[PDB]
């Protein structure tokens, strides 16, 4: 079991690492859907 | 081991619960950047 508490601590690292990978992707959708509504105004702005 | 066997069975579904979201946030970015180009297709076309 002393080997196993290394294995617990092995993937407990792997859990919050993938959480940070989502944190990049949560940041990834964030400005993208944000800068859409900035540019979607602009493509309506040039039309007028 | 049977104490630690179910903990693996817990954590395997936990990583599965995160991997479902990374399946979502990838395709949501694919929903974004694909729609970004058609937005970027207009801003070149309207300014031309």
Tab-separated table of C-alpha atoms in Angstrom, chain B:
chain	number	residue	atom	x	y	z
B	1	UNK	CA	-6.573	-4.077	-2.448
B	2	UNK	CA	-10.373	-4.107	-2.443
B	3	UNK	CA	-10.309	-0.843	-0.574
B	4	UNK	CA	-7.988	0.458	-3.279
B	5	UNK	CA	-9.733	-1.327	-6.140
B	6	UNK	CA	-12.886	0.735	-5.766
B	7	UNK	CA	-10.862	3.935	-5.459
B	8	UNK	CA	-9.436	3.232	-8.886
B	9	UNK	CA	-13.026	2.602	-9.970
B	10	UNK	CA	-13.949	5.969	-8.501
B	11	UNK	CA	-11.094	7.895	-10.079
B	12	UNK	CA	-11.541	6.263	-13.484
B	13	UNK	CA	-15.053	7.656	-13.629
B	14	UNK	CA	-13.735	10.983	-12.369
B	15	UNK	CA	-11.283	11.335	-15.259
B	16	UNK	CA	-14.148	10.222	-17.480
B	17	UNK	CA	-16.247	13.043	-16.040
B	18	UNK	CA	-13.576	15.545	-16.974
B	19	UNK	CA	-12.893	13.980	-20.380
B	20	UNK	CA	-16.519	14.519	-21.329
B	21	UNK	CA	-16.023	18.240	-20.779
B	22	UNK	CA	-12.838	18.308	-22.839
B	23	UNK	CA	-14.880	16.628	-25.546
B	24	UNK	CA	-17.293	19.546	-25.203
B	25	UNK	CA	-14.877	22.462	-24.928
B	26	UNK	CA	-12.886	21.231	-27.907
B	27	UNK	CA	-15.948	21.113	-30.150
B	28	UNK	CA	-17.149	24.416	-28.747
B	29	UNK	CA	-13.886	25.959	-29.869
B	30	UNK	CA	-14.513	24.205	-33.174
B	31	UNK	CA	-17.905	25.886	-33.087
B	32	UNK	CA	-16.100	29.153	-32.451
B	33	UNK	CA	-13.143	29.272	-34.832
B	34	UNK	CA	-15.175	27.904	-37.732
B	35	UNK	CA	-17.725	30.662	-37.181
B	36	UNK	CA	-14.860	33.098	-36.701
B	37	UNK	CA	-13.673	32.604	-40.279
B	38	UNK	CA	-17.091	33.327	-41.784
B	39	UNK	CA	-17.105	36.410	-39.600
B	40	UNK	CA	-13.600	37.174	-40.865
B	41	UNK	CA	-14.745	36.408	-44.403
B	42	UNK	CA	-17.194	39.299	-44.264
B	43	UNK	CA	-14.876	41.914	-42.740
B	44	UNK	CA	-12.459	41.450	-45.612
B	45	UNK	CA	-15.319	41.384	-48.102
B	46	UNK	CA	-17.145	44.401	-46.710
B	47	UNK	CA	-13.987	46.490	-46.484
B	48	UNK	CA	-13.164	45.501	-50.058
